C-alpha cells in the first residue's frame, strides 16, 4: 500500500498505487487509495479498508458543510487537527489506519497522521509497506528547486522502485497534482504510461 | 377562546394556532421559482435596505448543497434555524447513502421537523415557509414546505405576501420547457404584477441550475438586464 | 365548558374533543372501496386542482406494500404521518414473521397508535380516517380506522364528506362477488350520488388487486371509460 | 365545579369523574351471564346493523383463552384495548405458573390496570365494564369489573343499559344448578324483560362452557330456537 | 376556594382535601375490635346484600398473615390496594428479618405510604381507614391507620359511620382482660348501640386470635349465638 | 390573591404560605425546655386523652439517640416523618464520623430538609416545629427548628400555642446554672402561666440529661411531685 | 461455499452451489445461498448461516421500503455503501460473513464486501473456500467480448472444477441472470442439467 | 397582572418578581464595609434581642475561609443556604487550584447560582444580598451580590434597610487608605446616620483583615470603644 | 391577552413577549462601533456613577479573545451570562479547529443559544443585545445579535436607547476606509447626536483593533482628546 506526497514551490504532488490484498492472496487488482476531500485538498488512505473509507466519508461531508456555511475553505492545519481529535477520542478502541493530508491555502503543506492522532508536518512523507524503499529513493534525488514535471517523474520512479521489492504493492499509478491556479488535477492514464515509457520502466 | 393552544380543535375542527403561523408567513417578501427545460430557477424580491449591511447576509436564497437550494419567508430567526437543519439533514443523507439521491427525503426531514411542533403543547410552530429546488437522480425538482409540514411538488410557485397574485399569474401564463432566459423574464413579470401601485421593482436575487451543472447566482448586473 | 381537554368526560359521558376529530375528518373529499370476487378495489374522488401540481403527490390512495394499500381523508399533515407509520409497521411485521401474513395487525398497530392520543393530556388526536384494503393469507380484506382507533372489517364503505350518502347507497344496492368491472361501475355510481346538484364528477383515482396478483392503478384513460 | 378533575373530592366525598365513566358504560347494549350445574354461560344483546359489516368483528363476547372469555359494554376503543390486555395478562400468568390456575388474578390484573387511571391527573379512566367467565382449578367463575376497578364474583349478572332490569329479574327468578338449556332460556327471558315496549328481541350471541370442555359459541340457528 | 388542592393551607392552617378523605371514610360500615386476656378480636358490621354475591369476597376482615389481620372502611378500590400493600410489606419484613417480629413496622409501611400522597400535587389521598390487629413478640396489638397516615395503638376502637358512638360506648364500658366470649358480647353491644332506630343488627363477621395460636374466623352460626 | 403558591412574593415581600405553616404550628400543645448546670431538660404539656390509647405512643418527647432527643408541635403526620428523618440522619452522621460529634449538624440536616420544601412548587412545607436538646463534645445544646428551616441555639424556649407566654415568663425569670430540680420547677411554673383561666395543669412528660449520662424520662409519679 | 459473479456487456451472471456443512459432517445437501433483494439486484451470502440470513432479511426490507417511498430503485453503489455502514458499526462484535452484491442501474456492477466493511468494485469476484479454484479458472478463460450463453457455460465450468478439489462444496448449481430487458431471471434445473450434459461433466 | 411569574416581562420590560425579592432584601438590618490601607473591614448593625439566644448564632458576619468573609441581609433561611454554598464553593476552588487565588470567582459561583433562579418557572429567587470581603493574590476585595446575581466590586458599600443613607454618606465622606481605626470610626458614623430619630446605636459586630494576616472579630469591648 | 406566553402567536402573527425583550434592551445605554481601513472599533457611552465602584467592572466592552470583543445593552445579569457563554464558545471553537478561524460561528453559537429560549414555554428570553467585532482569517467583522437571535453583519451600527438616532446619523454620514482617528471622531459625533438637550457627553470607553495586531483599550486621557 505504497503512498507518497512531496511539496515543491507552490505545488503538491501526491501519488499512490492500486492493489488490495489481505492474505498472501491478491483479491483485487484495481482499488481506490487517492481521494479528493475539498477544492484544494487531497488525502491518501493506507491500512484497513473499512475504517479508511468511513474516515473518507466523514471528512468529505464535514469539509463540505464547513465550506457551505462559511464561504471559505478550511485551512490544512485545521483539517489535520480535526482529524487528529477524531482519531484520538477513540484511542483505546482504535482505527487501524495511517493517512496523509496535503493541500494549498497560502503555502503547500503535507501532514502525516498516525493511528493514535499525532500529526507532524514534514516536507515529504510516505506511508505503507513500501515506505522504506520510497524514503530510500527520495533521500538521494529530492531537491527543492525541482519543477513540476521533474516531481511527477520522481514520484513515478520512487513507486516503480518500491513495486519491485515489495510483494504487497503493484498495479497502475494514480498521480494527482494540486496547484493554486488550476486546482486539484488528476493526471490521465495515457500520460502516466507515456512517462513510464520515456523513463524506461515496465508495466 | 380556542386560539390559545396548539393542541385544541375548534368545533368546526380547525387549528387556529397553525393558521396564525400561516398569517406570520404572509408578512415576508415575495419569492418565486419554477422549473424549465433541464433545470429550475428561483427569484426572490428584496426591498433594498441600509448600505451598512453586508449583502452576503440578506440573501433569502441559500445554497444547502451544490445541487439543492432554497428560499424562505416569515420569521427571520426560525428561517435561519430551518435552513441550518436542511443543511445538516442533507449532510446526513449524503453520508448514509453516498450522495443526495433524492431531494424529496431532505424535504421530508424538514417537513416532519416542522410538523412535530404543531402537535405538542409547550412548543410553538415555525412561522416560515420554504421553497426547495434542485437537481437529483430524477431531474428538476420544486417543492414548498408550509408551517404545518405539508409538502407538495410543483412546476411553479411563490411564497410570501404576494403569493396569491404570483400563483394567479403563473396559473394563467406559465408554459413549460422555456429556455432559461425566457423563463426568467416570465418570472420577473410574475414578480412585477404582485406589487402595489407606485412601487417600482428593485433588483431581485435570481439563481438557477441546469442538468449536469452546479448552481450559479446571477450577479446584480446580469439581474439588471431584465429590469 | 368540557370540549377543551381530551381527558374529560361530559355528564352524559362523551368525549367532545374525540368527536371534533370526527368533525375534522368530515372536511375531506369522499373515498370509497369494496371487495368482490377474488379481490378488493378503492375509489377516491379528487376535485382537480392547479395544473402546476405534479400529479404523483395528490393521490389519496397510497401503496403501503405490493399487497396492502390505503386511502385517507382529513388533515393532510396527519394523513401523511399516518401512511408513513403504516409503511414502517408493515416492514416490521414482514421482517419479524417473514411476510405480511395478516393485514389485521398492521391495521391494529395503526389503530393503537391513533387510540393512544385520545387518552393523554398534552397531545391532540389525529384528524384522519384511513381505509385499508389488500390480499393476505385469508383473502380480500377491507377495514376503516377512525380517529378514536376503532377498526371494523367491512365488505363496502366510504369516508369523507359524502360517507353517509355513499354507505346509504351501498347499503341498498351492493351485491357481492361482482366481476371487477361491474363492481367499479357500481362504486362510480355510489360516488356520483354523494355530490351536490350542479357538480359534475371529475376523474377519480381507482385501483384494484386480485388474488395472486399485485396492485395496479387504473390510469386516467382507463378511468375515463366509466364517466 | 368539581366534576372536572379525576383527582378531586366533592365535600360529600364523591368522585364525579369516576361516576361519569359509569354513565358512559350505561350507553352500551345489555349483556348477561350466569353459572349453572358444571359451567357458566354468557348472553349478549345485539341490535343488528348494516349487512356490509363482517359478523366476526361485532361480537361483544370474545375468547381470551380456551378456558376464559369475556364481554364488554361502553366505549368501543377502550373495550378493545381492555380485552387485548386481558389476553396478554392471561398469557403471562400461563407462562409464569404453567397454566391459567385461577381466573381471579387475571381479573385482578385487569382490575388494577383499570383502577390506576382513577387516581392520577392527566389520564382519564376507561369507560368500559367487563364480565369474565370460565373454568379454573376451582370450577365455574363469574366476575364483573367496573370502571373504578371494583370486582365482585357473582352467580348471575348483567351490564349495559338494561343491567338494573335484568339483575332485578334474576334477583327474583334465578335458581342455581339448572341444566344448560333451561339456564339459557331463563337468561333469554331476563334479556327480554329489559327492552322497551315495541322492541322485538333480535338474535343474541350466546356461548357456554362445561367442566372438562372448552368453549363453543352457539351459532345463529341454535340461537334461533329460543326466540 | 382552598379545598381544591392537596398542597395548600387555609389561613387557619387546615388541609381541607385531607379532611374530605375523612368524610369519604365516614360512608363505610362500622367495624370494631379490641384486645383482651391473651389476644385481640375484630368485629365488622355487614348489611347483607344480594345472594348472588359469593360471600368469600365481601369480607371486610382480611388475613394479611397467619398472625396479622385487618379490616377497612371507605372506598372499596383503595381499600383493596391497601390490603394488598399490607400483605406485600408483611412478606418483605418477614424475609429481611426471618419473621414478622413487630406488627408496628408493618403498620408503619402502610402509614408512610398513605401519608406520602397527602403532600404532593397531582395525587389524591386514599379514602380508607384500616384497623390492624394480631400477635407479635410483644403480644396483642391493635392499631388504626387513617387517611393522613396517623397511627395510634389502642386497647379498643372502631372505624366507619358509627365510630363516634362505638368509641363513646367503649370509653365508658370497656374493662380489660375479659375472657374471649364476654369480650365478644361487649363488642356486639357496642356495635348495636351505633345503629339508628328500627334497624336490626344482622350477622357480623367476627374473628379472633390468642397468644400461641393462629387466627380463626367464627362461622355464621357461632356468630348467630350472640344475636 | 398571593397566599396560594409557595413560590410567590407579596409586594411587601412576604411568603404567606410559609406563614400559614406558622399558623399550623400554633395549634399544637405547649412544649418547653432549657439547659442548666451540666445538662438540659424538656417539658411537654399533654391534655390527657382516652384511656384506650397506649401511653407509649402519645409522647411528644422522643429519643433520637441515647444522647440527643426532641419534641414537636403541629401536624402529627409531618411530626412523625420529621422525627424519623432526625433518627436516620443521626445514624448517618454517627457512621461517617464514628460518633455524633455535634448536635448542630443533625439539626442542620433536618433544617435543610424542611427549608427545601419552602422554595419549590408542587410541594407544601412541613407544619411542625421541633426542639432539639442533648449532650455533645461541647456540652448542653438546645435548638428550635421552625417550618421555614430557621434554627437558633437558645438557653430556654417553648413551642406550640403557649410559646409567647412561656418565652415571656422565661425572658424575665430564668437564671442559668440551676440544679436540676429547681430548673424543672421553674419550667413547670412557666408551663402553668401559659394556660387559660380555669384550666388545671395535668401531668406533663418531663425528661433530662446530665454531662456524662444518658437520658431518663421522669415517670408519672416523679412528675407528680411538682404539681 | 463456492460463489461467483461475472459481468458482461449489459448482463450480470451470478452462480452458487448448495451444501451446508459445519463439521467434517454434511448436514444438508440442499440449501439456499442466492437471493433476490430488489427488482434488478441479487446477493450471494457465504460464511455463517444465521448472520447471513439476518443480513438478507434486513436488506430486503429496507430496499423494499426505499423503493416504495421513492418510486425509483436504489443504485448499486448506494446498496454497497449502506451495507458497509451496517457491517462496520459493529466491527468489534462482528458478523462472520463475506458477501457479493450485483445488479444493473445503467451499467453492470459487482461489489465484494468483507466482514469489516470494505467494498471494492471489480469485474469478476468469488468468495468461499473454492474461491482460489474459481479464480484459477477465470484467470485463463474470461474475456470481455463473451456472450450470455458463453458466460453461463463459463460459471458452470468454474464451479464444477471447484467441486472436484474442495471437500466443503457440492450439489446442484443455482444460476441467475440479470438483464435490463428481462429482469432477474433464474435458470431452470433441466436447463442447467442440459448445459452440464452438453459440456461433458457429471452430477 | 404580571407580578405573578418569574418568567414574564412587563410591557416596559421589567421583572416585578425579581424586584419583589429586592423589596424582601430591604427588610433586613443595615450592614456596611470598606477597604483601607492594606485591608478591608465589615460592620453589621444588630438590634439586640433576647438574652436566651446564644450570641454565636446571630452573627450576620460569617467566616467562609480564613481569608474570605461575608455578611447578609434578607430572609434568614435563604441567607443560611447562601453562606453554606459560599463555603462549599470556596473549598472546591481551593482544591482544584491549590488555594483560593481570586475572591472574584467565589463571588461568581454564588452569583450564577443566585441568577439561575430568576429565569426558570417553578422556582422563586433568593431574597438575600451578600457583601464579600477579603484578601487574595491581588489584595483587598469588596463585592456585593444582589438577588438577580449582579456583582460589582466597590471601595465602600452597605446593604439592608439603611443602604441608601449609608452609601449617601460614604459617597460624600469616604477617603481611601485610612489607618484601620479611623476607617472603623468613619464607618460607625455612617451606620449612625442611617437610623431613625430616637434610636440609639447598640453594639455592632465589626471585623477586619490586613495584608498578610487572618481575620479577627473585634469582641464587644473593643467594639464598645467607638460608641 | 396574548402577551403572557412566549409560545403564542397573535392573530396578526406577532410574538409580543419577544418584542417586550426588545423593549427591555431599549433601557440600556448607547454603544456603537464600525469597521475602517484595516480594522474595527467600538464606542460605549457611560453615564459616570459612584466613585466607590472599581472601574474595571463597569466596562460594557469586554474582551472575549485577544482577537474578538463585544459590548452589551439591557439586563445586566443576562448580559454577564451571555458574555461568559461567548468566551466559552470561543474556547471550544479554538480547541476543535486550532484557532478562532471565523468570528461568524462564535456569533452563531451565541445566536442559537439566544434563539432557543424564544420558543419553549417555562423559559423567558434574554433581554440583551450584543455587538461583536474583531479580526479573523477574512478581516474586520462587525455583527449585532438581538434577543430573538437574529444576526446581521454590518459596516456600522449601534444598540441601546440611542440606536435609532446613531444609525440614522451613520446612515447619512459614514464613509468607509477612514484612518482610525477620523473614524473615532465620526463615531463620537454619532454618539453626541443621540443624547437629549442639556446632557453633556461624559468620557466613553473606546477600543480598537487593526489587521495583524491585538486589541487595545484607549485609556481615559486618550479618550479625553476627542471630547
Residue numbers in the entry:
A (entry chain J), G (entry chain K): 1 to 203
B (entry chain R), C (entry chain S), D (entry chain T), E (entry chain U), F (entry chain O), H (entry chain P), ...: 7 to 233
Paste lines from the article:
The C-terminus of PAN contains an HbYX (hydrophobic, tyrosine, and any amino acid) motif that is required for binding to the α-ring and opening its gate. We also determined structures of PAN-αWTββαK66A in the presence of ATP, without and with substrate GFP-ssrA, both to resolutions of 3.4 Å. Because of the symmetry mismatch between the heptameric α-ring and hexameric PAN ATPase, PAN does not engage with α-ring symmetrically, and not every binding pocket in the CP is occupied by a C-terminus of PAN. To obtain sufficient resolution to evaluate the gate conformation, we applied a C7 symmetry. Thus, the density of PAN in this reconstruction does not represent its correct structure. Whether without or with the substrate, the proximal gates are in an open conformation, consistent with the gate opening by the C-termini of PAN with its native C-terminal HbYX motif. Furthermore, the C7 symmetry averaged density map still shows rotation of α-subunits induced by binding of PAN’s C-termini.
In archaea, the 20S is composed of homo-heptameric α- and β-rings, and PAN (Proteasomal Activator Nucleotidase), a homohexamer proteasomal ATPase, is the RP found in many species. Unfolded substrates enter the chamber through a narrow pore in the center of α-rings, where N-termini of α-subunits form a gate to impede unregulated access to the proteolytic chamber.
